[PDB]
Swiss-Prot record:
Keyword Transcription regulation: no
Gene3D superfamilies for the chain: Glycoside hydrolase/deacetylase
Source organism (scientific name): Colletotrichum lindemuthianum (Bean anthracnose fungus)
Principal location class: secreted
Residues where acetate binds: D21, Y117
Catalytic activity from the UniProt record: [(1->4)-N-acetyl-beta-D-glucosaminyl](n) + n H2O = chitosan + n acetate
The gene coding this protein: CDA
Assigned EC number: 3.5.1.41
GO terms under biological process: cell wall organization; chitin catabolic process; polysaccharide catabolic process
Name the record gives this protein: Chitin deacetylase
Cofactor: Co(2+)
Length: 226
């Protein structure tokens, strides 16, 4: 799987990787329950301290359930800054801080990440590559953060349907949603699953989307010497 270079689609067609950024937060437990009931795995790009602290409250338990249920856990940086705007030392710190938290939680560090605001240019990419990260972008943005009211979430479900080509054999998608919005969880997610199966796609983690064995998704161990 490419390192230090933004990835937009799967390595095979007929696949959808549903992804969720900016958690974990209030609605994430319910989202895990919904995905389980659907037998669907997904991918979470998590922060360390953004809408909540990943080590506060039940969040450590939600992160542990993500892994237990087979969802891919990726980094979204610790504090959600625009990585372009930081010096290399500060970008390295944003990644390592999150890795230290996920190691405290469940003894892992992500090899997968997504840049806040999809903002990560060649300067940023070089550093992330030196850290051995896979950079995950999107080729289908639900705009769920804009369509986040009971009466407007259908616009995001429609956007998904519109963009999801009926031509299952020639296409695959990495889908951007944000589970920190209640409507993303209690309405949009079921519609995404329904719509993707109605067209013949299979939902997959980004790991499977890119042909990557789950044994490669994480650094299972800290190297004492770098
Ligand atoms: Cl290093
Ligand atoms: Zn974000």
């Amino acid at each position: 799987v490419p390192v230090g270079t933004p990835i937009l689609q799967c390595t095979q067609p007929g696949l959808v990787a549903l992804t969720y950024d900016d958690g974990p937060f209030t609605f994430t437990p319910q989202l895990l329950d919904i995905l389980k009931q659907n037998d669907v795995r997904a991918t979470f790009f998590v922060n360390g301290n953004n809408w909540a602290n990943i080590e506060a409250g039940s969040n450590p338990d939600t992160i542990r359930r993500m892994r237990a249920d087979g969802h891919l856990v990726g980094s979204h940086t610790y504090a959600h800054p625009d990585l372009n705007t930081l010096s290399s030392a500060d970008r390295i710190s944003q990644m390592r801080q999150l890795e230290e938290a996920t190691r405290r939680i469940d003894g892992f560090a992500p090899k997968y990440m997504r840049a806040p605001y999809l903002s990560c240019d060649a300067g940023c990419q070089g550093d992330l590559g030196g850290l051995g990260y896979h950079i995950i972008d999107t080729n289908l943005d639900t705009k769920d953060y804009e369509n986040n009211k009971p009466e407007t979430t259908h616009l995001s479900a429609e956007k998904f349907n519109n963009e999801l080509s009926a031509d299952v054999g020639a296409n695959s998608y990495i889908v951007l949603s944000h589970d920190v919005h209640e409507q993303t969880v209690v309405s949009l997610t079921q519609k995404l699953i329904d719509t993707l199966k109605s067209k013949g796609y299979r939902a997959v983690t980004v790991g499977e989307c890119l042909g990557d064995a789950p044994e490669n998704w994480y650094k299972a161990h800290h190297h004492h010497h770098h």
